[PDB]
Amino acid sequence: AHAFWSTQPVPQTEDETEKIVFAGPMDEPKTVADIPEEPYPIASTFEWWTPNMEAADDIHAIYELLRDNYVEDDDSMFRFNYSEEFLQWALCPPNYIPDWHVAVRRKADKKLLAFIAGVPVTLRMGTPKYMKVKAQEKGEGEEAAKYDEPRHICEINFLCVHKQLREKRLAPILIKEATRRVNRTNVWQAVYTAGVLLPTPYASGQYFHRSLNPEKLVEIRFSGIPAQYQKFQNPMAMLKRNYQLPSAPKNSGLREMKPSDVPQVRRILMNYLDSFDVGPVFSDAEISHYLLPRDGVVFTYVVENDKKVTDFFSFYRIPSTVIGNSNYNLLNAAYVHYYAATSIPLHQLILDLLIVAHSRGFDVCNMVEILDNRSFVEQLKFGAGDGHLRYYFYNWAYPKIKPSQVALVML
Ligand SMILES: CCCCCCCCCCCCCC(=O)SCCNC(=O)CCNC(=O)[C@H](O)C(C)(C)COP(=O)(O)OP(=O)(O)OC[C@H]1O[C@@H](n2cnc3c(N)ncnc32)[C@H](O)[C@@H]1OP(=O)(O)O
Ligand SMILES: Cc1nn(C)c(C)c1NS(=O)(=O)c1ccc(NCCN2CCN(C)CC2)nc1
Structure with missing residues (x-):
């Protein structure tokens, strides 16, 4: 049971994934025009904020949220402490899109509550070699090569909700808003990694x-x-x-x-x-x-x-x-x-x-x-x-x- 992930254009089970032969989109083609211009709705005590990644103080604020609330092992022994300079490097590669850095802030005092980041990546993600070989045996090479060209896509990282705001369904809302801002720039795929199991890994x-x-x-x-x-x-x-x-x-x-x-x-x-x-x-x-x-x-x-x-x-x-x-x-x-x-x-x-x-x-x-x-x-x-x-x-x-x-x- 995944109340959020079941609504998304991802394969839903391992069995579905082991059944796939060619690379391609899951969703119907959509258009920039189809996508809402207005940010995803959020409770009125909160606002969306797009931090400035070349401003040292905004970096600091993101830095502190991650320092105190980002990945820990399951035994609470270690928590990542990505440095400010690391974050500027990770979040601001060439041709990065400032809009793709998405934060939630408390309206009253501008306290940072959550974060997710997208950055551009050019990625080869066409049908893998062994499936191409099979498709060639079977006269389906055209279908297997359709998406061989490197795609300009988005790479998601640094999803973080404050410890006091956990299990209040805020992560789905961050992900929806990130998706919207990326779709608005005419990009329809993303790549992400996680230490946790979700629907559904292509590799592990x-x-x-x-x-x-x-x-x-x-x-x-x-x-x-x-x-x-x-x-x-x-x-x-x-x-x-x-x-x-x-x-x-x-x-x-x-x-x-x-x-x-x-x-x-x-x-x-x-x-x-x-x-x-x-x-x-x-x-x-x-x-x-x-x-x-x-x-x-x-x-x-x-x-x-x-x-x-x-x-x-x-x-x-x-x-x-x-x-x-x-x-x-x-x-x-x-x-x-x-x-x-x-x-x-x-x-x-x-x-x-x-x-x-x-x-x-x-x-x-x-x-x-x-x-x-x-x-x-x-x-x-x-x-x-x-x-x-x-x-x-x-x-x-x-x-x-x-x-x-x-x-x-x-x-
Ligand atoms: C076209 C472009 C599209 C762009 C979008 C691409 C998709 C990107 C997807 C994001 C890739 C990020 C890659 C990384 O950065 S992976 C690193 C993630 N960060 C951390 O682990 C830091 C410490 N933990 C936290 O901050 C919170 O526990 C997080 C924020 C992880 C969840 O918040 P919370 O614990 O307060 O829960 P909720 O009540 O708000 O929400 C519950 C829902 O969230 C689903 N969940 C839990 N963990 C993850 C996870 N790591 N990726 C995707 N989804 C996750 C979960 O299955 C459930 O959905 P459902 O099972 O009920 O269906
Ligand atoms: C030393 C340490 N710090 N932290 C926070 C953890 C989990 C460790 N232990 S560890 O053995 O080096 C380790 C163990 C598991 C792990 N999992 C991957 C977490 N993901 C890492 C990559 N990221 C893009 C998404 C989050 N990463 C690191």
């Missing part, structure tokens, strides 16, 4: 974690000491030793990315991403925005052996408030972002990622089993966590695919 993958500071992670109970370590005289010394890393990167040529790297980086990234069924298409402007280093937010390194860039890796920072332990304020996580390797094995590229993230004081390295992330798990000592990232479309019928056919990283 486990989270993986690479301990960088194991003693801190045990202390805060992000991690436990596995039971075989108890046969050691000093469990923690064995644990520290098991996860230890060099201080200096191993690849010669490794340096930080710079603006003149953009075209080379774009080329090797796009060549690599194009091999997945679902992936973003990036302009020079978007490579520069999503990958150029920004202090405390995104860290990007290239391999340049012979004034020629042949590999790169990137990671981003999300700290979490450590809610139940007084000895630490923040767990500092580094998230594996985009990468491409043409001159060295991927496990060797990513070892340097761990080395850099460790030397910069990160506690853990996190990723989902999308891209070729499975390919270096065992050797680099990542372990699976209890979490899953699920990938969804809005108003797009899509076959169930494996997470290793997904090339879209979500922030």
